Amino acid sequence: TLPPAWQPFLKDHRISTFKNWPFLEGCACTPERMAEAGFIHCPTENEPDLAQCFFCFKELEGWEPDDDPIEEHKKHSSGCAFLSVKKQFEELTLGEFLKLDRERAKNKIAKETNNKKKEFEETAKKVRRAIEQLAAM
């Protein structure tokens, strides 16, 4: 129906990514609610309840049953434009949609920039330490 890169914009796709999500009926953070809020399920060995906003790329773990996904998103990523979108997918215009997909592309890039930066700084600490140690000895 739609190209893969775009599917995350569809609630039903997002819900479908929740495979062995523990919080089901009786909980506030169900797949349906997590998906309404923008989240995708990206579990690891290490953190199996890991969820990520498809739009702003904020990751959250440590979900609890009474957690309202929307309020958790607002808290941890207050600037995410997906939270601003009021219309359903099919009510957006192509211009609106293209404007959203650009802001998402830019969010992805900011995330990868921010990671590269952190990795580089960790490597720079190690190298600096090694050289201090050598000058000290």
């Binding site: 953070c29 969820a51 990751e59 959250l60 773990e61 440590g62 979900w63 609890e64 957690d67 941890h76």
Partner: peptide, 4 residues
């Protein structure tokens, strides 16, 4: 929930 909480930030990684």
């Amino acid at each position: 929930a909480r930030t990684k």
